Design a protein around this ligand. Structure first.
Ligand code: 5JG
Length: 281
């Protein structure tokens, strides 16, 4: 009797949820009774990268936080990661359709929840490396959870960063300068990405206001292989994403502390929580 062991014969595919770094996530129904009363689960499998999937399963299995998507089990030399299903999807799907319901106060409550989940990850000595609104799952109108731990790496004890080797598919427009220049990942690099995720959240993930769309306006969209170097050059000059429309300056200042060039000059997740909470009450 293993509640974390899912039999393949009972896992019925419903549809695709997402595709990414050599993996795919699908909506399935675990139906051991065969009457469609079974629980719906998000199933991550591979499209050799079994080693990365296995490390991701080991990371998520030992993470327990209300703002972190829940591990449910595995389906087994192939393996599948079984997670809880959040029907609202991510901030990217949810925010454009719920602008009327999600006011400034609620956006700040989501930012606090994202910081809490991230601070918990950082206390376990992990760097997420893919913090974006597309990876923030919606449990309800009052709660969000960090999903997709596909790029998550451990920082060694008595070390401040993780050195990245495979960087071909890096979300460069969400990355801190030390990540773009030296392929070094600090907890402070996740703080930088949080500032960008906060920007998306305040713009309700509008495609025309996206960090990529906005940065490509600043540096040019026709530079190809020279994009990253032009982006690094722009950041070095002190240029950042502009204040979102209807965003109060006090929220903008918190965001800009995420974007200090030097990692050691950046705000912490705990300072962000304090800052947002002072604005809330
Ligand atoms: C309306 O469009 C969607 C609705 C949805 F409900 C979902 C969804 N995705 C997951 C999911 N993982 C998937 C990844 C996706 C991209 N970011 C990181 C999560 C997990 Cl673990 C648990 N429930 C989930 N629900 C996705 C959707 O389109 C992206």
């Amino acid at each position: 009797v293993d509640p974390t062991h899912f039999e393949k014969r009972f896992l019925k595919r419903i549809r695709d949820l997402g595709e990414g770094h050599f993996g795919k996530v699908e909506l399935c129904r675990y139906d051991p009774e065969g009457d469609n009363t079974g629980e719906q689960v998000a199933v991550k499998s591979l499209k050799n990268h079994i080693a990365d999937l296995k490390k991701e399963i080991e990371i998520l299995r030992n993470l327990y936080h209300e703002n972190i998507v829940k591990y449910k089990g595995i389906c087994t030399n192939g393996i599948k990661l079984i997670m809880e299903f959040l029907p609202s999807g991510s901030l990217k799907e949810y925010l454009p359709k719920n602008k009327n319901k999600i006011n400034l106060k609620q956006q700040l409550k989501y930012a606090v929840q994202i910081c809490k989940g991230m601070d918990y990850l950082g206390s376990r000595q992990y760097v997420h490396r893919d913090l974006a609104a597309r990876n923030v799952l919606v449990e309800s109108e009052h709660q969000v959870k960090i999903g997709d731990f596909g790029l998550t790496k451990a920082i060694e004890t008595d070390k401040e960063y993780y050195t990245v080797k495979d960087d071909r598919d890096s979300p460069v427009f969400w990355y801190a300068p030390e990540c773009l220049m030296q392929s070094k990942f600090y907890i402070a690099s996740d703080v930088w990405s949080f500032g960008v995720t906060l920007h998306e959240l305040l713009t309700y993930c509008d495609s025309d206001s996206s960090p990529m769309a906005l940065f490509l306006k600043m540096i040019g969209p026709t530079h190809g292989q020279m994009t990253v170097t032009r982006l690094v050059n722009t950041l070095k000059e002190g240029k950042r994403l502009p204040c979102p429309p209807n965003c109060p300056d006090e929220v903008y200042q918190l965001m800009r502390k995420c974007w200090e060039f030097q990692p050691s000059n950046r705000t912490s997740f705990q300072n962000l929580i304090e800052g947002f909470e002072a604005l809330l009450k």
